[PDB]
Design a protein around this ligand. Sequence first.
Ligand SMILES: [Mg+2]
Lengths: 266, 148, 84, 100, 244
Amino acid sequence: PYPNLIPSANDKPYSSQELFLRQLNHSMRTAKLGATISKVYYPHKDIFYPPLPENITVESLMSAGVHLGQSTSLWRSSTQSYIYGEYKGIHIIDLNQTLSYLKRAAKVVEGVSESGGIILFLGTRQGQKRGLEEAAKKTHGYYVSTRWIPGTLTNSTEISGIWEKQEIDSNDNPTERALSPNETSKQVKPDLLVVLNPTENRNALLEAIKSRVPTIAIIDTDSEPSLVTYPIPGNDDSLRSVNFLLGVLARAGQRGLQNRLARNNE
Amino acid sequence: IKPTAEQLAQWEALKSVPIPPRKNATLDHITNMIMRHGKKEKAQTILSRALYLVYCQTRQDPIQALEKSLDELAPLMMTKTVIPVPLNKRQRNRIAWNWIVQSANQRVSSDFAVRLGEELTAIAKGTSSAFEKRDQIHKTAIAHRAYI
Amino acid sequence: PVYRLPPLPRLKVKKPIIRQEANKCLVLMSNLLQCWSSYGHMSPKCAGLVTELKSCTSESALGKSNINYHAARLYDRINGKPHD
Amino acid sequence: NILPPGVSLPNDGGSKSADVAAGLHKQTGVDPDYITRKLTMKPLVMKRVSNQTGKGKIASFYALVVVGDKNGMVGLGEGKSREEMSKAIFKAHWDAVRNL
Amino acid sequence: IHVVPKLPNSKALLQNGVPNILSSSGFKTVWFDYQRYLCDKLTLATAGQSLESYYPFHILLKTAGNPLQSNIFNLASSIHNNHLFVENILPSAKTEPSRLFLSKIKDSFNGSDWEVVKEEMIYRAENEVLGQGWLFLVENNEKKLFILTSNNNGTPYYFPRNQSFDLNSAISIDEFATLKQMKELIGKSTKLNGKVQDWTMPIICVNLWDHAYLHDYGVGNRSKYVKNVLDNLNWSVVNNRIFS
Ligand SMILES: [Mg+2]
């Protein structure tokens, strides 16, 4: 439990570490006494307990702030059909269209994960690393959050060719087989690319277009809907909305992975 | 190692004291100014002998008298090309020492130590022409203050 | 009224001006010189100020603008150019 | 023998179509056999283009080629090479295969 | 929304309440009615604020040092203390006092055995706690137990808010000295909030509020209620609360 700890003698008072363990024991048992908190938003849960696509309501999407679009002065008129209206100097996104597009994109992610494809979560804004990493880990996928190197797809040999690759079974179990140099030097291309900030990742979208990689993205009021295969109308500048949508997609991918493993284990 | 009683007592007693100075900065700087050709000991002998005459004719600490003299004679600021500029301790000491050395060289003794010691004795008694030089420098600084 | 500049190649100040603080030694010297100008040289009145100078310059006689960087960094965000 | 751990000399280890097919399969996953067997290339434009520079005039070779399997797939590729025209044709073939 | 915690064996407690201390009607007053009352008041007080996200114990630890939200603190304190009280009187999660707790009482109370200490706690509750209050057996950082009493809603954790001295009446000069040293301890800290460290924890809690005993034991005879509480405690919880 807590090795390399030297308890104190009964005559002497508690030590700092003994006090820490005493307070930990208190916290895990009695600190939570008196009431149970209900109907309160805790940000971390948005990453760790995302809802299923079918359980999402318009109220839940509005609570996450998905509806809040860009300023009316920065409007991209090609996004007219996704807009419910304008309010307080900003455009409001139609959350029913958002719900439909999000369910469709979640089905796409679930199908791709169930087929064993490679899913890449690209988001390069400040505090998006946590959700991206968790989505990649629970979908058995991959993620980028520092910077998208241009040419990562169209120039894969000169960018990603040096990093190591791995053969795996139907159950995602390492086989530890030795790969030939030609096999190691092939391009490994994502089967699905999801972008949280498509406005700042035009290079990735264009590379996916050139390389025929279907792509999902959160299309804000100032973003181009036609640059992506499966747009999701929603707010991309709020971390809560981005994490909510990303958690939904990641849970869909996890469900697909679980279905794949269940079928392989029967 | 566990320090024994004497070692810890020594450590406490000493840490309760400051470190001694290696050298008196002012006296060392004056000596180096007297120095030529790397003959430090000759300069030290000359300076100590002059200070010894200063004591023998004044019977007060001659190191203190020398510093009173350098502090009072030396100009605080000087006009340069025309704006005044402040002077730090070493520059003031150098100017004062040069003024002292001229008046010393004006004296009669064949030994430079005797001339320097008697000049320092006269300065310690408030008798020197270098006060006029200091006054002129300060007057010029006052005249040209506007160009700071 | 508000004036909107065109899409510009850059947003940069030709000569950024920095607020260097005048040295304490210089102003103390100026005050001493004014003291000796009014009361007189080696006057009893302001002699105390001399002591300060004697300390302030004892060790040494005298004892940065990032506007262009931030402007270049932020210009693409704030210029308000039309979409494309 | 003193061979390094991995040699890479295909004749001493102890054309355009083949290299194009191999590099394309390595970089994009295209099938080499289809490229080598089914595709046919005809150079359309072949010229020399020059650039002035303070030290001197620099010459380069431009090639524009069209590839196709004659069954509904056609692609255009352009290649530049300062060294030789053959390398320009190679790059044009590469690009044309990429633009099918 | 702070909600009343669910209790084990809730149906049995509704039917009869805690055996040998409270009847069903009394247990309704002490827990089902009073805890709901306190939780609803805390929710009304703290809704739309940060404090809705924190548990009552973390609320009172946060709010102990600020004068103007004492009401919230009071509610939080009660909402904590009441539950603590309930947990030491629940029929079960016969439980016996542990060897470690007996050793600590013997060592902490100058060799006195546990039962005379129970009688001493009865005496303390009868004497100092005039009206509403809380009684605790608490351990300090020195592994020493002692008996603490709080007037109205007070907390054992933070000694500035112990509320162990009733200033409505007089105070002994020793109590005034204790108050002055306590205030000096508070003032010494360099923190802007003025917080101080106190590692005291409650091992035993008894509810001297009128909600607990008035319906079952009358205006008087509170010491009878305290004796009944102490005799028939749930010793599993009490033993767990101590750290070894
Ligand atoms: Mg945006």
